[PDB]
Each structure stands twice: as structure tokens, then as C-alpha cells.
Design a protein around this nucleic acid. Structure first.
Ligand SMILES: Nc1ncnc2c1ncn2[C@@H]1O[C@H](CSCC[C@H](N)C(=O)O)[C@@H](O)[C@H]1O
Length: 327
DNA sequence: CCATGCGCTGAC
DNA sequence: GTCAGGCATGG
């Protein structure tokens, strides 16, 4: 994550729904905002959140009376994406994990925050012939919000990961916000190799498969793209090896393969998974952030999470818009 | 709970 | 054709 000198969101209150690791919290707090409520139902996510922020999020949002939620200015929600991902069944709103947006809508209707700030997978914009996104837009419009949606790739915002997500920013109509812009992409100057731990700290992550097939030469020149170097097995998910001189493939939460959740990388002549701290860095988490004691849960958590830096630029622009109030 | 081989998908 | 992006089942 980056340093934010001008605290655009000072004095504003936010809630952290589907909190996970608290990526939205780190991003908005860096812009000066104050968290007043958090909600997350996974036992291990609750633990890591408490380890980092000192508080246990409330559980199952579907059973929370929306009237009990504190007054707030910005509602944040990176809501579940399994039902919308191209790696899943794409049942969408028909999936029990696919109806959480309607809980967001229920809370917005009651609490009427200035801003609603949501994140999901890129496929959310395409799913069901665009109807899924249109449902969200229309729901927010019906609640008297404007709707701004764009897919952003983390590699365009200083983080070496291909991670294309949809970001949906909504302003209450009475605020007359007409100048919200998504942040402009800029040149990437950091690559996977720049975020790696020393070899001595990751020896246990080395995998030596005799069915490794190298399909492409290692590169010496860094590049802002994924660079496949080889495969093991049949080369499905988690069975693909990439160059550290490129960017990381997207981290996953429920993924498998021998290099599960992180993918495999060529490091000093050997192939290995990423360490959870390398996952944190690939998601823009600061080294001060405390990783969950279970490595399996840590990988799941980072796989579900948000890239802090992207959220910081967006949050800064939300604040920039709210603050422009000429006579 | 933790581990891993898929077996498809959207987008080229 | 290519490549990046959760489910099922094993224990
Ligand atoms: N009914 C529910 N109540 C509370 N949390 C829920 C929920 N259904 C799913 N979730 C949680 O919603 C999260 C979506 S992933 C969100 C990750 C978060 N943005 C971060 O910064 O890490 C998951 O952690 C999942 O456990």
C-alpha cells in the first residue's frame, strides 16, 4: 500500500462488510476515514481481523437487523464472488453465496450512506448477458444513487498481479456528484521478484515434480504481464509455472493443483509456491499486517481479498469528489 | 480440517 | 488453436 498525504476522507465514517482481512479498512483508514462497524462470518477471518484491528466483526449479515448498523457515510463491500467467477458454476443470484448483494441493498435502503463502494470479479460485468450488472445498477438507481462501474487491473496501479475486478461506486443523488473518476493507470515498476522473501525462508514451498515440462525460456527483462514458463501434470489450475520477472497470476481462495492458490514460480532454478507473506505483498498488504496462523486459511484469505493500492486510489477519488463543493 | 487433480469457462 | 480463472473428493 502507499502513503496518502492529503487525507480526503477525514471526518467520514465507514462500515466494513464482508470484511475478510480488512483490505477496505486499511485503504479507507489510510485516507483518514473511521471504521464504525465490521461484519464477517468466517471463524478464521474473524480471528485475523481481530489480530489486526482489535475487534471481532459481527457474524452472518443475513441475520443482522439493518436498523442496528451504525450511521455511516461510506458502505464498503467486497461481496462473495464464487457464484460469478469464470472458474465456478456461474449460478449467480441462484447460488446461496450469490444473493449477498440484496443484503447490501437492504442495508443501504435503511442507512442511506453518502457512498456505496463495492467490489467483485471482472466476470460480474458480463455474467448472464449483462443482466447481473444491470440488476445492481437498477437497484442502486431505485435507491436514489448514481452508479459508476469499471473493471480495473491491479497491474495498472503499481502492484505486480493480474487481478481484474469490477469496482462499483455509488453516490447518493442529493449530493449531485458529477466529477467522480476512476484512477488513471500508470507504468508498473515492481515485479514478482521484487516482493519475494529470501530463499532461506521459503525452502518448504519448493516442489520438485518429475513431470515438470518447461515450455518457454526464462526472461531477464521485466514485463507487466504474466509469463508462463512451464507446467506439471496436465497444466490445469495450480499446475502452471510462471516467471518472477513478470507479474503474479490472480490469487485464489478455493483453488487446487499442486501449486494451489498461488501458482508456481521459477526461483533460482527451482519451482515453488508463494509464501503467505508474499501473497500479502502481492495484494498490497503492508509487512506490518499480521498473517493468520493457519497457512491454509491465510492463503484462502488473501485469495478472497482486495488489492489495497487500487482501493486507495479509488477512495482518494471518492473523497476528492465529496470535497469539491464550490459556492 | 488440509491437499490436489481436475474440467470446464470467458476472452481472445 | 491459446491462456488465465472454483468444484469434487481424497484423507
Ligand atoms: N453471510 C455472510 N455474513 C458475513 N460474511 C459473509 C457472509 N457470506 C460470505 N461472507 C464473507 O464475505 C467475504 C467475501 S471475500 C471479501 C474479502 C475482503 N474484501 C478482504 O479485504 O479481505 C468472505 O470472507 C466471506 O467469509
Amino acid at each position: 500500500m502507499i502513503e496518502i498525504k492529503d487525507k480526503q476522507l477525514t471526518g467520514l465514517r465507514f462500515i466494513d462488510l464482508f470484511a475478510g482481512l480488512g483490505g477496505f479498512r486499511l485503504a479507507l483508514e489510510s485516507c483518514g476515514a473511521e471504521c464504525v462497524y465490521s461484519n464477517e462470518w468466517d471463524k478464521y477471518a474473524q480471528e485475523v481481523y481481530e489480530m489486526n484491528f482489535g475487534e471481532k466483526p459481527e457474524g452472518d449479515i443475513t441475520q443482522v437487523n439493518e436498523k442496528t448498523i451504525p450511521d455511516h457515510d461510506i458502505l464498503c463491500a467486497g461481496f462473495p464472488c464464487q457464484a460469478f467467477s469464470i472458474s465456478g458454476k456461474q449460478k449467480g443470484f441462484e447460488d446461496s453465496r450469490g444473493t449477498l448483494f440484496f443484503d447490501i441493498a437492504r442495508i443501504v435502503r435503511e442507512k442511506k450512506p453518502k457512498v456505496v463502494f463495492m467490489e467483485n470479479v471482472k466476470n460480474f460485468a458480463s455474467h448472464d448477458n449483462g443482466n447481473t450488472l444491470e440488476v445492481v445498477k437498477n437497484t442502486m438507481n431505485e435507491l436514489d444513487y448514481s452508479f459508476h462501474a469499471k473493471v480495473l487491473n491491479a497491474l495498472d496501479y503499481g502492484i505486480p498481479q493480474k487481478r481484474e475486478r469490477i469496482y462499483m461506486i455509488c453516490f447518493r443523488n442529493d449530493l449531485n456528484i458529477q466529477n467522480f473518476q476512476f484512477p488513471k493507470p500508470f507504468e508498473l515498476n515492481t515485479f514478482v521478484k521484487d516482493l519475494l522473501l529470501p530463499d532461506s525462508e521459503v525452502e518448504h514451498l519448493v516442489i520438485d515434480r518429475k513431470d515438470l515440462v518447461m515450455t518457454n525460456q526464462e526472461i531477464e527483462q521485466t514485463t507487466p504481464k504474466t509469463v508462463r514458463l512451464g507446467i506439471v501434470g496436465k497444466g490445469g489450475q495450480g499446475e502452471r509455472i510462471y516467471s518472477t520477472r513478470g507479474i503474479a497470476i490472480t490469487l485464489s481462495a478455493y483453488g487446487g493443483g499442486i501449486f494451489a492458490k498461488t501458482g508456481g514460480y521459477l526461483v533460482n532454478g527451482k519451482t515453488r509456491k508463494l509464501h503467505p507473506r508474499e501473497c500479502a505483498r502481492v495484494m498490497g498488504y503492508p509487512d506490518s499486517y499480521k498473517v493468520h496462523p493457519s497457512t491454509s486459511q491465510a492463503y484462502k484469505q488473501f485469495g478472497n481479498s482486495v488489492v489495497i493500492n487500487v482501493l486507495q486510489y479509488i477512495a482518494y477519488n471518492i473523497g476528492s469528489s465529496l470535497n469539491f463543493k464550490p459556492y
